[PDB]
Write a protein that binds this ligand. Structure first.
Ligand SMILES: O=C(O)CNC(=O)C(=O)O
Ligand SMILES: [Mg+2]
Ligand code: NI
Ligand SMILES: [Zn+2]
Length: 331
């Protein structure tokens, strides 16, 4: 078995190997990459996402989210308070202000220590989940707006044509902005490209051990667990690496820098934080190996998780027994 310790693997495809996205994902899996739940892909030196980032300041963040924490430093939830709209230029200036800017630090480890010590005492503003793309239309390799759609994959694997679309999303971050522990909708893959700015640190639990994280989360968030049998779908709970180590949960960590892709694999729980002002683009995707994960994915039916239009068909076709309850949650 390849990668039996479930380490995060880093890949350096050549420009030739960067042509066929599906083939390269299958290659990475042949080497055991999925066992970690997360992989890094460093593009060939010849590749670029677009020519410059000079003209992005007029993108609108219609609903910036202030991420307010409750709990203790290593075990907390966050809620998202909606803020007035602002442009990317306005948000960048805010991120760089004394109130929100990255503190002085020695290296990524020192910054990680400061994050876990102090996150809860601040409420950073995240421009998350903005439909759109920063890939130039002429970028033909690993252009996250030109991937094969998940509806087409389901159709190719299962023979059933379904409604829905699959488009990318932009994330504008600042110091301390946080993504809570989660797997993707329907335990899909994700791919994330850091277009510009400061790094993003990731934490990930191997898919084969995801249920250990869920059991700890039920213990640490006992009200939330009673509320919903899949409350990590709410994407609000944070657990630090120190707490994970104290409870014997297997995990790994890695820091993504500008110009790098990350891939999350089906049922790979992940969480993390931004180091400073940045912009990422991410999208879900599927492969043949996803199908069985999609069939077994948990679902939130309490009403909190509320998701996209396109999830309906995935539940309806892959999980018909759960469909009625799940849809009641959506309505
Ligand atoms: O970048 C973020 O805030 C969160 N991204 C992801 O969870 C992802 O790409 O799967
Ligand atoms: Mg602009
Ligand atoms: Ni994710
Ligand atoms: Zn729920």
């Amino acid at each position: 078995a390849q990668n039996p310790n479930c380490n995060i693997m880093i890949f350096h495809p050549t420009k030739e190997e960067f042509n066929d996205f599906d083939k390269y994902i299958a290659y990475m899996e042949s080497q055991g990459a999925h066992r970690a739940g997360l992989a890094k892909i460093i593009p060939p030196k010849e590749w670029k996402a677009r020519e410059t980032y000079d003209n992005i300041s007029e993108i609108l963040i219609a609903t910036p989210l202030q991420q307010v924490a409750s709990g203790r430093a290593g075990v907390f939830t966050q809620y998202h308070k909606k803020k007035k709209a602002m442009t990317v230029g306005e948000y960048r200036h805010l991120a760089n202000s004394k109130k929100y800017q990255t503190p002085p630090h020695q290296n990524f480890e020192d910054l990680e220590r400061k994050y876990w010590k102090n996150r809860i005492y601040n409420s950073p503003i995240y421009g998350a989940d903005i439909s759109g793309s920063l890939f130039d239309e002429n970028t033909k390799q690993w252009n996250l707006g030109h991937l094969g759609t998940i509806q087409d994959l389901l159709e190719k694997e299962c023979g059933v044509v379904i409604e829905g679309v699959n488009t990318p999303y932009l994330y504008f971050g600042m110091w301390k902005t946080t993504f809570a522990w989660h797997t993707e909708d329907m335990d899909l893959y994700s791919i994330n490209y850091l277009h510009l700015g400061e790094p993003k640190t990731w934490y990930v639990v191997p898919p084969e051990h995801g249920q250990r994280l869920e059991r700890l989360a039920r213990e640490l968030f006992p009200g939330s667990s009673r509320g919903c049998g899949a409350f990590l779908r709410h994407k609000v709970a944070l657990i630090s690496p120190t707490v994970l180590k104290e409870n014997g949960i297997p995990f790994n960590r890695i820091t993504q820098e500008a110009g790098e892709f990350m891939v999350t694999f089906p049922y790979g729980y992940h969480a993390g934080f931004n180091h400073g002002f940045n912009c990422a683009e991410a999208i879900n995707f599927a492969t043949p190996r996803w199908i069985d994960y999609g069939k077994m994915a948990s679902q939130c039916s309490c009403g909190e998780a509320r998701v996209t239009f396109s999830m309906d068909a995935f539940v309806r076709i892959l999980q018909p027994e759960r469909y009625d309850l799940w849809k009641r949650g959506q309505d």
